[PDB]
Amino acid sequence: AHFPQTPGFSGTLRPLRIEGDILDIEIEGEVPPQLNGTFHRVHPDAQFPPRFEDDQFFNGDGMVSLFRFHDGKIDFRQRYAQTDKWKVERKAGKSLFGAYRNPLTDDASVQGMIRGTANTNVMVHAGKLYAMKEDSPCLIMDPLTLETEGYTNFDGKLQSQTFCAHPKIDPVTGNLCAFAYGAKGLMTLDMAYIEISPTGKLLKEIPFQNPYYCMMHDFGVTEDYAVFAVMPLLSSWDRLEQRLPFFGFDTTLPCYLGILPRNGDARDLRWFKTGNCFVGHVMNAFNDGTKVHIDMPVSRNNSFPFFDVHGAPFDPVAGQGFLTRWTVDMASNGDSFEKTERLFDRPDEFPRIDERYATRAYRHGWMLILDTEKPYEAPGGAFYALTNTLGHIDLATGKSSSWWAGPRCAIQEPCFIPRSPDAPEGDGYVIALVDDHVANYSDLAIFDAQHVDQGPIARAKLPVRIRQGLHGNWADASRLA
Amino acid sequence: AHFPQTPGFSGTLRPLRIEGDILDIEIEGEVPPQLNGTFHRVHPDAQFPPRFEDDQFFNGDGMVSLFRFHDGKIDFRQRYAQTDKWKVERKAGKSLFGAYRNPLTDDASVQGMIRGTANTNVMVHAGKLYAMKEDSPCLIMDPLTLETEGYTNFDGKLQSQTFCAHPKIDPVTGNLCAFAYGAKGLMTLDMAYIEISPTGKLLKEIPFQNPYYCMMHDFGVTEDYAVFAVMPLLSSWDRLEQRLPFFGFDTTLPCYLGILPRNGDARDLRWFKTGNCFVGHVMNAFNDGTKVHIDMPVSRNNSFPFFDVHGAPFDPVAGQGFLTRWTVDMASNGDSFEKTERLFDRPDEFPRIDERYATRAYRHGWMLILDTEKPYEAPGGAFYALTNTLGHIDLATGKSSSWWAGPRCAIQEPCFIPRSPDAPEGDGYVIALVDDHVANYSDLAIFDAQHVDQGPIARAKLPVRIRQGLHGNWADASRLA
Ligand SMILES: Oc1ccc(/N=N/c2ccccc2)cc1
Numbered sequence: 001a002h003f004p005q006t007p008g009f010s011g012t013l014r015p016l017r018i019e020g021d022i023l024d025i026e027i028e029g030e031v032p033p034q035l036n037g038t039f040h041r042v043h044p045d046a047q048f049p050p051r052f053e054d055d056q057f058f059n060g061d062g063m064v065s066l067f068r069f070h071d072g073k074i075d076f077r078q079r080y081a082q083t084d085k086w087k088v089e090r091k092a093g094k095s096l097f098g099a100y101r102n103p104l105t106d107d108a109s110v111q112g113m114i115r116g117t118a119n120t121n122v123m124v125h126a127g128k129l130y131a132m133k134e135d136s137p138c139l140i141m142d143p144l145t146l147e148t149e150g151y152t153n154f155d156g157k158l159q160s161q162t163f164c165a166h167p168k169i170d171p172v173t174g175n176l177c178a179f180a181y182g183a184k185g186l187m188t189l190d191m192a193y194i195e196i197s198p199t200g201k202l203l204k205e206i207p208f209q210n211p212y213y214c215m216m217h218d219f220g221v222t223e224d225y226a227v228f229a230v231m232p233l234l235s236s237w238d239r240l241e242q243r244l245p246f247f248g249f250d251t252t253l254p255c256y257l258g259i260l261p262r263n264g265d266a267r268d269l270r271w272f273k274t275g276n277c278f279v280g281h282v283m284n285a286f287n288d289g290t291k292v293h294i295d296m297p298v299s300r301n302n303s304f305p306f307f308d309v310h311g312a313p314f315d316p317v318a319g320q321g322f323l324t325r326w327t328v329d330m331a332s333n334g335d336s337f338e339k340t341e342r343l344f345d346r347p348d349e350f351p352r353i354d355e356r357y358a359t360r361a362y363r364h365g366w367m368l369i370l371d372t373e374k375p376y377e378a379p380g381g382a383f384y385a386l387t388n389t390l391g392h393i394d395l396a397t398g399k400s401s402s403w404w405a406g407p408r409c410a411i412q413e414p415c416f417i418p419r420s421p422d423a424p425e426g427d428g429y430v431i432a433l434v435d436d437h438v439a440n441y442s443d444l445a446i447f448d449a450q451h452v453d454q455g456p457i458a459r460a461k462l463p464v465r466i467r468q469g470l471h472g473n474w475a476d477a478s479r480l481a
Numbered sequence: 482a483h484f485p486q487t488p489g490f491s492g493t494l495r496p497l498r499i500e501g502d503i504l505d506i507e508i509e510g511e512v513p514p515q516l517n518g519t520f521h522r523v524h525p526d527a528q529f530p531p532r533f534e535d536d537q538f539f540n541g542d543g544m545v546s547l548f549r550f551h552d553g554k555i556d557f558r559q560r561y562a563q564t565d566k567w568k569v570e571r572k573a574g575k576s577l578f579g580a581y582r583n584p585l586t587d588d589a590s591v592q593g594m595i596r597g598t599a600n601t602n603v604m605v606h607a608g609k610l611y612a613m614k615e616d617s618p619c620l621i622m623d624p625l626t627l628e629t630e631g632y633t634n635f636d637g638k639l640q641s642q643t644f645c646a647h648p649k650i651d652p653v654t655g656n657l658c659a660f661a662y663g664a665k666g667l668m669t670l671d672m673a674y675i676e677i678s679p680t681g682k683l684l685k686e687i688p689f690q691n692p693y694y695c696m697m698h699d700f701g702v703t704e705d706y707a708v709f710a711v712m713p714l715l716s717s718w719d720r721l722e723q724r725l726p727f728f729g730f731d732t733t734l735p736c737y738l739g740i741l742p743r744n745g746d747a748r749d750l751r752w753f754k755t756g757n758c759f760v761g762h763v764m765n766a767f768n769d770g771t772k773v774h775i776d777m778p779v780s781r782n783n784s785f786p787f788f789d790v791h792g793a794p795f796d797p798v799a800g801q802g803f804l805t806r807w808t809v810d811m812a813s814n815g816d817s818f819e820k821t822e823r824l825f826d827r828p829d830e831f832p833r834i835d836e837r838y839a840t841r842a843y844r845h846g847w848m849l850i851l852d853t854e855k856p857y858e859a860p861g862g863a864f865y866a867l868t869n870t871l872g873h874i875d876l877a878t879g880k881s882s883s884w885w886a887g888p889r890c891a892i893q894e895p896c897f898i899p900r901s902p903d904a905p906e907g908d909g910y911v912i913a914l915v916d917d918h919v920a921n922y923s924d925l926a927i928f929d930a931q932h933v934d935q936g937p938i939a940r941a942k943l944p945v946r947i948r949q950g951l952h953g954n955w956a957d958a959s960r961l962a
């Protein structure tokens with residue numbers, strides 16, 4: 001139809017809205033022949049024009065992309081996640097749900113429905129594909145056909161209304177370790193830590209309470225504890241009644257770090273306190289005894305202009321997040337941090353690890369780098385959320401390498417793949433969508449994990465440019481059993 | 482995975498190979514709200530890399546695109562035509578058939594199979610979609626789902642092995658009027674004129690003989706006769722044994738024009754003779770009494786670099802085709818033409834008419850114009866087959882108007898739609914795919930048929946660039962019953 005001619009739908013953020021398939025993608029170079037598995041990712045892509053022309057980036061319907069690696073070939077499939085919102089709006093032929101996380105602006109016909117778009121994360125678990133959005137239950141899809149089974153409550157057991165979009169895989173038990181904030185509705189302090197068995201059965205749902213009505217986007221999991229970074233990105237029902245953005249960052253309130261024993265309950269929860277800041281995605285987290293470390297980009301204010309926060313608009317310099325380790329001790333009194341240490345001196349986000357070392361001690365990480373010292377010759381805005389560099393950091397030595405995508409391209413969230421099941425940490429490949437904004441083409445580029453500076457060793461050249469996405473994951477073919 | 486790095490697969494001729502859908506295409510401007518129907522077109526698009534790195538453009542598997550118009554909205558669907566070749570090659574995962582129209586280069590596993598790609602024309606008839614390739618029978622598909630039913634012989638009646646890709650619709654009887662060359666196999670002089678009832682039943686299959694083993698791509702149909710333009714674009718089994726392109730244009734042999742009474746047989750066929758030249762697509766053809774006129778672009782040699790002709794590579798100046806009327810008389814003795822008259826002074830091809838006046842006297846025509854005096858700012862060659870202008874000609878007065886697509890875009894074969902069932906000749910709309918080769922985007926542009934100079938009145942903006950195609954047709958929704 002007629003989408004708004006606003007910057008949110010023009011330029012590189014133009015609507016895509018195409019589901020389809022491609023058999024045997026064009027390959028420049030050679031795909032690692034031993035690779036055999038599935039790479040899932042997802043982007044927001046409103047099926048119809050929004051009700052309000054200022055609709056946020058995070059409110060678009062979820063479009064899931066599957067790249068199946070097998071025998072040096074890559075197949076492409078892309079489908080809409082058939083959420084309840086998507087089904088009802090397709091039947092209606094127009095957009096019925098309102099602004100981001102604002103049910104006071106919804107149409108009367110869909111009142112009370114699950115407003116999730118499942119546009120934030122996609123991960124293969126328990127033989128199915130979990131599609132996740134923070135404000136809604138987990139949606140279940142087929143990993144290979146991308147058909148939508150629908151929202152789940154895990155055989156009826158799960159009591160929480162929501163389900164996070166950043167679960168971690170326990171590298172010993174294979175359990176899905178997730179959480180949920182706003183578990184009893186919007187603007188509710190209820191929280192839950194959740195563990196799902198490798199067969200999809202809910203194992204534990206430990207409830208507790210949160211310091212604020214704040215966004216809990218990501219969290220950490222260690223061998224013994226679950227870590228929750230609480231930042232004062234607040235929400236107010238009063239502010240929703242005033243037709244303002246749902247989230248809004250208070251620069252006066254402090255930040256908390258909640259450590260919960262995985263085999264405990266809310267009584268065992270310990271809160272630590274630190275200065276005001278903005279926390280991003282958790283690279284990893286691990287515990288040495290009672291010492292708990294968590295790694296994440298920290299910044300003064302909004303870490304991405306995709307967020308529409310209350311107050312002043314985007315501050316491009318205060319939003320620079322740097323990879324930082326927070327260290328608390330469960331063996332100490334009080335609520336004081338043991339250490340905060342900046343790990344990387346360039347503004348970065350979307351961190352990644354060798355997922356085999358999740359929850360455990362590690363050293364190799366990959367990230368997107370916002371390099372402003374580089375030119376950008378593409379008309380159509382989008383200079384601010386421009387993640388144009390891919391970087392690899394060795395945390396054991398501080399050495400780092402990087403790779404620039406040129407003045408035409410941007411990069412999406414990378415993902416690591418091991419060379420062999422029992423290969424050294426970070427020994428393998430890093431894949432990521434590189435987007436040429438001049439020619440409008442997307443390459444699934446594959447780098448050497450240890451030599452990302454050497455550029456890609458292979459590119460799966462697509463005949464279309466995939467829209468700006470969020471998170472994706474790799475799963476070996478064996479996980480489809 | 483690895484396509485040849487030749488110009489035939491690089492630049493604007495890159496492989497597309499994406500089947501998919503788009504619900505409610507982005508519309509710049511307004512689509513005529515009364516329009517309700519289907520626009521089908523098709524382009525070559527080899528599913529896998531070829532067996533020979535010099536594969537021609539016409540040898541790629543057929544990719545069919547449907548634009549459904551309804552209530553001012555347009556939906557997009559695109560699917561592979563599942564020919565026997567396509568199915569067997571997908572089962573094999575690689576290309577099994579050899580060079581263009583050369584079974585001597587095929588793999589042993591597909592010997593005897595139908596090597597058609599159904600990549601030349603797609604037209605709605607008898608409630609189904611006929612997908613056509615000159616060297617193979619007609620393929621039957623679903624007009625709305627683009628599902629493939631398969632090759633047909635029309636309840637077993639049709640004796641011809643082949644089926645042309647340029648059928649004409651009788652504006653009185655509703656019959657599909659087609660022909661066939663090589664009807665008894667490759668390199669056979671056997672020809673057939675064919676009529677299919679509006680319910681799909683074979684009505685006539687009148688066989689005759691051809692002057693040469695030559696390409697019969699298009700033909701004419703009048704109220705009383707069928708017209709066959711014979712040009713010495715020859716093929717030889719020797720030429721296949723010598724691993725040469727299937728076709729090769731002899732500049733020494735003459736051209737013929739065969740007029741056959743539609744309700745007659747081979748004895749009634751009359752051949753007329755004229756000088757050597759190259760004939761293109763038939764705009765229209767009609768008879769006034771015994772006088773028979775046919776309109777088509779004529780040129781010295783190869784009219785498009787899509788063809789690989791024997792001898793020297795493409796000559797862009799000898800290849801300029803001009804719309805020309807040939808006129809013979811069935812009441813005169815001998816084989817002399819009554820008149821040959823050039824109707825349009827600019828190099829043109831892909832002509833189109835108000836199909837309501839097919840086989841009858843007419844005046845309004847549309848065409849693609851090769852305007853070489855215009856700039857073209859796209860890197861990657863392809864300055865030669867650049868159809869950058871859309872033109873409308875009034876044959877009753879010789880007046881003509883045109884429209885340039887700019888230095889970034891090219892145009893594909895247009896198609897006419899009447900404004901209303903009872904509108905004057907050429908009163909309506911002209912639709913065509915305009916392709917931005919710098920940004921790689923395709924718009925289904927809609928013009929006023931009488932004021933194409935006023936630019937498009939609407940654009941269905943796609944988030945992808947459709948490959949260079951061949952022929953398409955429009956069908957009202959009523960024809961889907
Ligand atoms: O529904 C949601 C909710 C939160 C959300 N955060 N994204 C980001 C992206 C980058 C840094 C920090 C947060 C995205 C979608």
Ligand SMILES: Oc1ccc(/N=N/c2ccccc2)cc1
Nearest residue numbers: 539601615698760761762784785
């Ligand atoms: O399979 C085929 C066979 C013939 C063919 N001719 N195209 C043209 C195009 C322009 C002028 C004359 C012929 C196209 C595809």
Ligand SMILES: [Fe+3]
Nearest residue numbers: 217281470471
């Ligand atoms: Fe995120």
Ligand SMILES: [Fe+3]
Nearest residue numbers: 601698951952
């Ligand atoms: Fe043609």
